[PDB]
């Protein structure tokens, strides 16, 4: 009979378990025997308090480095403002020690936990790459609660070294099974930011995780976009509870908040899942998340049923992670087929955008070729366009099965005249659909202004396989 943790703050970790069902169903995974033993998670952040009384027992120097000062020790830099507390808070969510009379517990409270000190300084492309590519045959899961500015006017993503680190990680990392990169989808809700304008969350190589409040609502800071894959609980209003974790200076906090708290909880659940089947590939893990995540009682006005019967929202992806379902489904999972990539150049000539532009194209998805895809994973619309005020644009993509993905919603603060330069807008919402057939791209001016521009390139990039489908939900 499984005995739940006795830690003093465990009863306040409402998101881990409860009679109420507003939780991540983590105790169910613990009771199946999965607590994270043998899995290694690294927090890419501003450092980790490696001697914290609730982290020391799980701390792994092999999962750690200090990229900012070029040494092995990721200890945070202590200041009066406690600026560098952020990574320690994230680490305790994953792997705070259980049953030791201190604070609460991590989701994967027997996993090994490290940190890369890389945010406390100028975060260059090289800094990111050295962090994302740290010890990739030892670290299984990387958690990143950071990214480009959430001002609602930035379009930015990994530069060359960081993108090379992503491809090296998913291709050769973890013994060729692929590093697992977990990303917080963003805090730009108040600025009406879109997480598709963030190349880290928008990457197919990251599991981008959004947030829900305790009462099941879209938090004020949440960013909506089609690249988000799933959701974990985090903070909301001041009547809703927050996240309990390890704090700087060997303290315990019950007020960890924002998108920053959601990615580590997902990383911990993924750690439990990897313990249940260490042979899972980076793509396997995304399939598991898609199949097991739960929309129920998450409130959003944009819930839609996709072509294979799954509910999907731009605020939540496929819904809340469900640790018990993840670990159960993982145990007998059959490895997915190798990933195929079908490139379809859509345009035969540039197209003036004007007030509204619709581009329709019927595709065969590489029929007859070795990269034929009948079972979609990620899809990208790689767009090159000029426009006089970028944030007035709304962009939608409709799949042959009728699933309408918002690639870009209006961003009131984005005044840029720089347009999009082969920007790979990504959607998860057509996962497992057959991509053969008519795709529709819609670009529209959401303002009354007389805006102007031209779409010069639209590449539809399909990823997926040609085997192994489930009967639709």
């Amino acid at each position: 009979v499984y005995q739940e943790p006795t830690d003093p703050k465990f009863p306040q970790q409402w998101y881990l378990s409860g009679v109420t069902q507003r939780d991540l169903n983590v105790k169910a995974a613990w009771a199946q025997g999965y607590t994270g033993h043998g899995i290694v998670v690294s927090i890419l952040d501003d450092g980790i308090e490696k001697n914290h009384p609730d982290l020391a027992g799980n701390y792994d120097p092999g999962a750690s480095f200090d990229v900012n000062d070029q040494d092995p020790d990721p200890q945070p830099r202590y200041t009066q403002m406690n600026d560098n507390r952020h990574g320690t808070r994230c680490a305790g969510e994953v792997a705070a020690v259980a049953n030791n009379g201190v604070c609460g517990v991590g989701v994967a409270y027997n996993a090994r936990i490290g940190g890369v000190r890389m945010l406390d300084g100028e975060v260059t492309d090289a800094v990111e790459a050295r962090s994302l590519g740290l010890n990739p045959n030892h670290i299984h899961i990387y958690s990143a609660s950071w990214g480009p500015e959430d001002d609602g006017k930035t379009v930015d993503g990994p530069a060359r070294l960081a993108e090379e680190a992503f491809f090296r990680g998913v291709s050769q990392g973890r013994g060729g099974l692929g590093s697992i990169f977990v990303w917080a989808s963003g805090n730009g809700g108040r600025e009406h930011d879109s997480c598709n304008c963030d190349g880290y969350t928008n990457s197919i190589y990251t599991l981008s995780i959004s947030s829900a409040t305790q009462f099941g609502n879209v938090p004020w800071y949440s960013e909506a976009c089609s690249s988000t894959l799933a959701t974990t609980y985090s903070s909301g209003n001041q009547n809703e509870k927050q996240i309990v974790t390890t704090d700087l200076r060997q303290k315990c906090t019950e007020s960890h908040t924002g998108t920053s708290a959601s990615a580590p909880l997902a990383a911990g659940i993924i750690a439990l899942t990897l313990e249940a089947n260490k042979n899972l590939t980076w793509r396997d893990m995304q399939h598991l998340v898609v199949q097991t995540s739960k929309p129920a009682h998450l409130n959003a006005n944009d819930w839609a049923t996709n072509g294979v019967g799954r509910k999907v929202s731009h605020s939540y992806g496929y819904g809340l992670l469900d640790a018990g379902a993840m670990v159960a489904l993982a145990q007998n999972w059959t490895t997915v087929a190798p990933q195929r990539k079908c490139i379809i150049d859509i345009l035969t000539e540039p197209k003036d955008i004007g007030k509204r532009l619709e581009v329709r194209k019927t595709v065969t998805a590489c029929l007859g070729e070795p990269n034929h895809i009948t079972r979609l994973e990620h899809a990208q619309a790689r767009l090159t366009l000029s426009y006089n005020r970028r944030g007035d644009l709304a962009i939608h993509l409709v799949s042959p099965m009728g699933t309408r993905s918002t690639l870009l919603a209006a961003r009131p603060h984005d005044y840029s005249a720089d347009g999009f330069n082969d920007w790979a807008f990504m959607t998860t919402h057509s996962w497992d659909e057959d991509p053969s057939g008519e795709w529709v791209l819609e670009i529209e001016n959401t303002s009354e202004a007389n805006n102007y521009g031209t779409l010069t390139k639209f590449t539809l990039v399909l990823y997926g396989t040609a085997s192994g489908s489930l009967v639709p939900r």
Binding site: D45, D46, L119, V123, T124, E128, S145, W146, G147, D156
Partner: peptide, 4 residues
């Protein structure tokens, strides 16, 4: 360039 990058933010917590």
């Amino acid at each position: 360039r990058r933010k917590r």
